[PDB]
Design a protein around this motif. Structure first.
Motif, mmCIF file in Angstrom:
data_model
loop_
_atom_site.group_PDB
_atom_site.id
_atom_site.type_symbol
_atom_site.label_atom_id
_atom_site.label_comp_id
_atom_site.label_asym_id
_atom_site.label_seq_id
_atom_site.Cartn_x
_atom_site.Cartn_y
_atom_site.Cartn_z
ATOM 1 N N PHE A 131 2.238 24.218 13.485
ATOM 2 C CA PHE A 131 2.010 22.833 13.105
ATOM 3 C C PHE A 131 1.058 22.010 14.045
ATOM 4 N N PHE A 132 0.549 20.948 13.709
ATOM 5 C CA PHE A 132 -0.155 20.303 14.653
ATOM 6 C C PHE A 132 -0.347 18.784 14.455
ATOM 7 N N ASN A 133 -1.278 18.012 15.018
ATOM 8 C CA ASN A 133 -1.416 16.451 14.914
ATOM 9 C C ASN A 133 -0.043 15.923 14.621
ATOM 10 N N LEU A 134 0.539 15.925 15.829
ATOM 11 C CA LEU A 134 1.948 15.167 16.033
ATOM 12 C C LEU A 134 1.837 13.561 16.337
ATOM 13 N N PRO A 135 2.767 12.803 16.253
ATOM 14 C CA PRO A 135 2.686 11.234 16.581
ATOM 15 C C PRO A 135 2.420 10.972 18.201
ATOM 16 N N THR A 136 3.490 11.381 18.751
ATOM 17 C CA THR A 136 3.817 10.790 19.979
ATOM 18 C C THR A 136 3.897 12.046 20.976
ATOM 19 N N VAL A 137 3.058 11.923 22.087
ATOM 20 C CA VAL A 137 3.109 12.913 23.155
ATOM 21 C C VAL A 137 3.712 12.396 24.168
ATOM 22 N N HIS A 138 4.786 13.540 24.810
ATOM 23 C CA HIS A 138 5.572 13.251 26.010
ATOM 24 C C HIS A 138 4.889 14.072 27.190
ATOM 25 N N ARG A 139 5.437 13.826 28.338
ATOM 26 C CA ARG A 139 5.096 14.327 29.491
ATOM 27 C C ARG A 139 6.255 15.431 29.856
ATOM 28 N N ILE A 140 6.141 15.902 31.137
ATOM 29 C CA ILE A 140 7.054 16.656 31.564
ATOM 30 C C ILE A 140 8.331 16.136 32.043
ATOM 31 N N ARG A 141 8.178 14.774 32.512
ATOM 32 C CA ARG A 141 9.261 13.974 32.910
ATOM 33 C C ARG A 141 10.219 13.486 31.817
ATOM 34 N N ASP A 142 9.530 13.541 30.651
ATOM 35 C CA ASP A 142 10.590 12.703 29.428
ATOM 36 C C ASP A 142 11.374 14.088 28.934
ATOM 37 N N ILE A 143 11.084 15.360 29.556
ATOM 38 C CA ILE A 143 12.167 16.264 29.015
ATOM 39 C C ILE A 143 13.446 16.348 29.433
ATOM 40 N N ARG A 144 14.531 16.244 28.574
ATOM 41 C CA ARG A 144 15.827 16.210 28.777
ATOM 42 C C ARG A 144 16.394 17.309 28.129
ATOM 43 N N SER A 145 17.679 17.465 28.022
ATOM 44 C CA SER A 145 18.256 18.606 27.191
ATOM 45 C C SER A 145 19.061 18.296 25.976
ATOM 46 N N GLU A 146 19.055 16.920 25.615
ATOM 47 C CA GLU A 146 19.332 16.407 24.275
ATOM 48 C C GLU A 146 18.348 16.813 23.332
ATOM 49 N N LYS A 147 16.982 17.081 23.767
ATOM 50 C CA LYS A 147 15.788 17.309 22.739
ATOM 51 C C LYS A 147 15.414 18.654 22.596
ATOM 52 N N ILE A 148 16.595 19.644 22.862
ATOM 53 C CA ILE A 148 16.527 21.110 22.515
ATOM 54 C C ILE A 148 16.464 21.326 21.097
ATOM 55 N N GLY A 149 15.643 22.512 20.698
ATOM 56 C CA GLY A 149 15.539 22.829 19.612
ATOM 57 C C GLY A 149 14.142 22.169 18.773
ATOM 58 N N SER A 150 13.936 20.910 19.146
ATOM 59 C CA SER A 150 12.974 20.125 18.436
ATOM 60 C C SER A 150 11.609 20.348 18.534
ATOM 61 N N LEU A 151 10.522 19.672 18.087
ATOM 62 C CA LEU A 151 9.105 19.912 18.355
ATOM 63 C C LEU A 151 8.826 18.710 19.086
ATOM 64 N N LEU A 152 7.740 18.754 20.070
ATOM 65 C CA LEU A 152 7.201 17.835 21.014
ATOM 66 C C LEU A 152 5.880 18.370 21.472
ATOM 67 N N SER A 153 5.120 17.564 21.723
ATOM 68 C CA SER A 153 3.383 17.608 22.052
ATOM 69 C C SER A 153 3.359 17.321 23.660
ATOM 70 N N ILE A 154 3.436 18.522 24.266
ATOM 71 C CA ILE A 154 3.160 18.566 25.885
ATOM 72 C C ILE A 154 1.746 18.778 26.382
ATOM 73 N N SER A 155 1.447 17.728 27.290
ATOM 74 C CA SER A 155 0.092 17.748 27.635
ATOM 75 C C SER A 155 0.244 17.928 29.442
ATOM 76 N N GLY A 156 -0.512 18.936 29.655
ATOM 77 C CA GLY A 156 -0.790 18.940 31.134
ATOM 78 C C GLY A 156 -1.830 19.834 31.618
ATOM 79 N N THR A 157 -1.868 20.669 32.806
ATOM 80 C CA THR A 157 -2.921 21.213 33.440
ATOM 81 C C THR A 157 -2.474 22.796 33.522
ATOM 82 N N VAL A 158 -3.506 23.776 33.068
ATOM 83 C CA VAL A 158 -3.090 25.275 33.094
ATOM 84 C C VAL A 158 -3.598 25.697 34.511
#
Lengths: 284, 96, 284
Positions: C100-127
């Protein structure tokens, strides 16, 4: 050479029974007569032949007569193979027994020696204490479980177990049996035990027993308390209880002057004369 | 009693990083520059065991590329031959 | 019920992509456009599809949008099965990836919790500190040597060994592998390791790593020293070295209030959040 000998006698045998067999005229006993025996066997499907010795004594001027009569046990599969090719020429699962009869000179039990091994001989005596009828394998289907176990094989000769070479696939020598008690071809045999005639024994001693084995056609034809005439082939059976006879009895310590180093599987052997027969006529 | 052969001119040069899952058990031409290496060690090619129980030596085999295993039991009624490879009479092939 | 739920979403998905996908007029971007993507894939034979999320956000009034987005890991094989039946309807060995692509809302690494397991999320960072490319099995051919060893099977999920039930023939539970290193279907994956953006971190602490796995299409697309956007599925990896943290950490002592008598195979478990992604776009 020796295969040229046995194959040479084989083609002379095929040439023998293919040709004429009746010399008589229209007042007979007409031609042929062997092909009437094959076809007359084909109508009833009983799978044996009774051939005479005197006709084979006629033709070759005694040359082939002195070639089957000595080394008869050497010449089963060549004879039976050539007769099978005659059958596939003139006829459409087959077990063939080639039982000779009408021999010239009858011997007693006392004329048995051990220079007469292998040959044919006419034995006459008295049946006493017959036994019952039980099967025998002679057609193995025995190979190892890793992996292939479908090898039809040996133990026509009495060993019984097991198949030795070309194993398994893939478990090599000497991986062998488990055997199979449902894929074989059996036949049945009994073991009557003849006793010497009353009007013959040398004055004065006691009567003398002998063992004799009947396979295939001649099961049940014997009769407790009647005289018989048998058929010659006269095999040797392995015996145990003749120890401390005295000897000196031989032994079979195997050779080790081959293999170079960096156990004692030696054996004993003591043998007694039995007899093997296939045609039983009850004239007496 | 052995000649292994060469194959010279195979016309598809994959430089590197184009090796994928599909190219396994295939025939590949690669270019590169040689980094460090090791010495020269011998590897076994014909093996001749000797049973300590039943006397003498068994006989040659051809094993392997690359299994190097594990011939169990024969010639003494298949027992009880804990075997040992001897350092003599076994031809080696060098490795790098 | 739950199979009626997942099958219900499956038929709604087949019904989704079979129908219209372009609302635009002749000035377009003409109909359909999904069938142009299947057939355009058929001409070049590359075996993937890139489908958008916004079009699925249009149609169902958000009902099916709130059914794939939560329990995405539950809904791989139903989705991939329904898409395979669409392919066997409209097309003539197939491994399908549905990125999939073009999701609404982008989260960071700090917004990772463990209630959001399984779901989809847009992660942006630096390789930083990518690794190399190595295979992976996921298609077993492993059964016991006595006798049949031709069972295609499990280990799609990471175990790896071995096949458990219906064994062997005939060696029953739990006879299993030897596996097979020539009868399988592989694919290749690498493991890049993202590092948090420089213009985001809460003043004042240090940057924070995270692991991320790329399979299939998105191998090699990452770049050392560039920003990325990823794809959400966010699996859990078994971890070892978090002992004596302090706890209290759970354990899995199995039940014995069943089986009646006439050993201690208990285990530990400690888990750390990794991430799994399949679409890599390099905008940054």
């Amino acid at each position: 050479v020796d295969d040229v000998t046995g194959e040479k006698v084989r083609e002379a045998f095929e040439q023998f029974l293919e040709d004429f067999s009746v010399q008589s005229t229209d007042t007979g006993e007409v031609e042929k007569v062997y092909r009437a025996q094959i076809e007359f066997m084909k109508i009833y499907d009983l799978n044996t032949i009774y051939i005479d010795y005197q006709h084979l004594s006629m033709r070759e001027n005694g040359a082939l007569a002195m070639a089957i009569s000595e080394q008869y046990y050497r010449f089963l599969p060549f004879l039976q193979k050539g007769l099978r090719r005659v059958v596939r020429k003139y006829a459409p699962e087959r077990v063939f027994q080639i039982s000779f009869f009408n021999l010239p000179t009858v011997h007693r039990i006392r004329d048995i020696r051990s220079e007469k091994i292998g040959s044919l001989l006419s034995i006459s005596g008295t049946v006493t204490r017959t036994s019952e009828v039980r099967p025998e394998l002679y057609k193995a289907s025995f190979t190892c479980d890793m992996c292939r176990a479908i090898v039809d094989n040996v133990e026509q000769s009495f060993k019984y177990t097991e198949p030795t070479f070309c194993p398994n696939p893939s478990c090599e020598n000497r991986a062998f049996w488990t055997l199979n008690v449902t894929r074989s071809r059996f036949l049945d045999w009994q073991k009557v035990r003849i006793q010497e005639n009353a009007n013959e024994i040398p004055t004065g001693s006691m009567p003398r027993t002998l063992d004799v084995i009947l396979r295939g056609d001649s099961v049940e034809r014997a009769k407790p308390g009647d005289r018989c005439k048998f058929t010659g082939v006269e095999i040797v059976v392995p015996d145990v209880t003749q120890l401390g006879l005295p000897g000196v009895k031989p032994s079979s310590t195997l050779d080790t002057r081959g293999i170079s180093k960096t156990s004692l599987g030696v054996r004993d052997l003591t043998y007694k004369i039995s007899f093997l027969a296939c045609h039983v006529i009850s004239i007496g | 009693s052995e000649i292994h052969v060469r194959i010279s001119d195979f016309p598809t040069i994959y430089s590197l990083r184009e090796l994928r899952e599909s190219n396994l058990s295939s025939l590949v031409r690669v270019t590169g520059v040689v980094t460090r290496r090791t010495g020269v060690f011998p590897q076994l090619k014909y093996v001749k065991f000797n049973c300590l129980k039943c006397g003498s030596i068994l006989g040659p085999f051809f094993q392997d590329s690359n299994e190097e295993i594990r011939i169990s039991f024969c010639t003494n009624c298949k027992s009880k031959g804990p075997f040992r490879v001897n350092g003599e009479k076994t031809v080696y092939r060098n490795y790098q």
